[PDB]
């Protein structure tokens, strides 16, 4: 029984990492650091 729960802990530690979750792009800290402003310069392709 003791080794059973130890292996369960191993599973939790290795497969359920925080960045693995599907909704990481919304709950990520530093999400405004990795993104770009609305317009960059005067030749920004994104500004249609």
């Amino acid at each position: 029984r003791a080794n059973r729960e130890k292996q369960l802990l191993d599973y939790r530690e290795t497969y359920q990492k925080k960045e693995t979750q599907r909704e990481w792009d919304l709950n990520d800290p530093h999400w405004k650091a990795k993104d770009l402003p609305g317009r960059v310069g005067d030749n920004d392709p994104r500004t249609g």
Binding site: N3, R4, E5, Q7, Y11, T14, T20
Partner: protein, 177 residues
């Protein structure tokens, strides 16, 4: 099932599918698993020789595809992040080896006892020719002799007998076997 019961809590569904693919592909399945471990070791040795600290994600998924894993959308990145500890695009070898040859507590102790029974020499490593004649009439799974590269170490032993573990659904029967 095997990844949902309390008896084997370390198992995961997608990694189970990967192991199923590498075992049932194609030389029987346990031989393929020993070969997979050997290729992983030689690849990491070559990378250490070059000057890079480990196998990357791209060649890892390339190796998986080479052994015939029909992956899906997002599972490759799932496994790459699962075995990346420092989060730097590299695969940890010890964690992958521990998970690849994983087994239950009872089965692991049975394998350890069996390994401790056989004699060794030099740096803890066995030879085929010394013991093939002694155990010829009692080894039903003759693939063990094919696993020998006439030498073999504990990691290949554990990988081989973890491969056959799926055929025996009872732990006691596995131990007696």
């Amino acid at each position: 099932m095997i990844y949902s019961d309390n008896n084997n809590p370390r198992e995961d569904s997608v990694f189970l599918r990967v192991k199923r693919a590498v075992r049932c592909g194609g030389v029987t399945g346990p031989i393929q698993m020993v070969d997979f471990l050997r290729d992983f070791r030689c690849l990491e040795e070559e990378q250490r020789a070059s000057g890079r600290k480990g196998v990357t994600h791209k060649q890892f998924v390339k190796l998986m595809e080479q052994y015939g894993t029909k992956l899906r959308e997002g599972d490759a990145a799932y496994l790459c992040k699962a075995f990346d500890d420092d989060n730097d695009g590299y695969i940890n070898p010890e964690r992958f080896v521990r998970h690849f040859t994983g087994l239950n507590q009872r089965r692991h102790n049975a394998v350890l006892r069996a390994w401790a029974s056989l004699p060794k020499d030099a740096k803890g490593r066995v030879r085929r020719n010394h013991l093939n004649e002694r155990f010829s009439e009692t080894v039903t799974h003759g693939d063990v002799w094919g696993t020998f590269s006439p030498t073999l170490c504990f990691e290949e032993f554990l990988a081989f007998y973890a491969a056959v573990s799926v055929e025996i659904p009872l732990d006691e029967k596995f131990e007696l076997f």
